[PDB]
Amino acid sequence: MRNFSSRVDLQSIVLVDESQSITSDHFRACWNALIIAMEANPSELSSGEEAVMADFSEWIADLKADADKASYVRKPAFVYVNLNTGFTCVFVRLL
Amino acid sequence: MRNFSSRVDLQSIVLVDESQSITSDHFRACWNALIIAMEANPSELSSGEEAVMADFSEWIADLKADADKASYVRKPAFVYVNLNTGFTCVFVRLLEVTGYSIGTF
Prior knowledge:
The structure is a homodimer.
Chain A: E1 3-8, E2 13-15, H1 25-38, H2 47-68, E3 77-82, E4 88-92
Parallel strand pairs in A: 2-4
Antiparallel strand pairs in A: 3-4
């Protein structure tokens, strides 16, 4: 198996506003969506789970760095796939 | 092994307009993008590649079946991942919002 696809549920798509505060409820919801997706214990993240979270943090940072300038968004989306369960979610910064 | 994530380039996100005809060039454009992304042989698709393209054709038909029902759809995105190379693309059905407002509801 080299080729994965998933049809993603409306509820598994999260629209991300990088203008929202880092401390915001918006961003808390995004992080929770991801932990749930990974079926992870936040207090005891595996190394694979850590990599996902770090990648998510880097994704956010770039969203902010792009929106800081009046640029477009270079990487407008974040995909996470649970390869055990096939659960896929997609965070998107609209436009 | 268990957890994949990808930061997706803008050009690897495809906007899909489900209101196009079943037979539209647009859908064939989307189809090719997926064939390309799999590095697949449209002539001799493997089982795994054929599963992907059937997933997709099904994805499109559900957009249309669902768009007759509501302004949103049940499954608005289609994710493809080359698990060998990490390459990911994302087909998304969004409404384009255009027009004017006086600044009230």
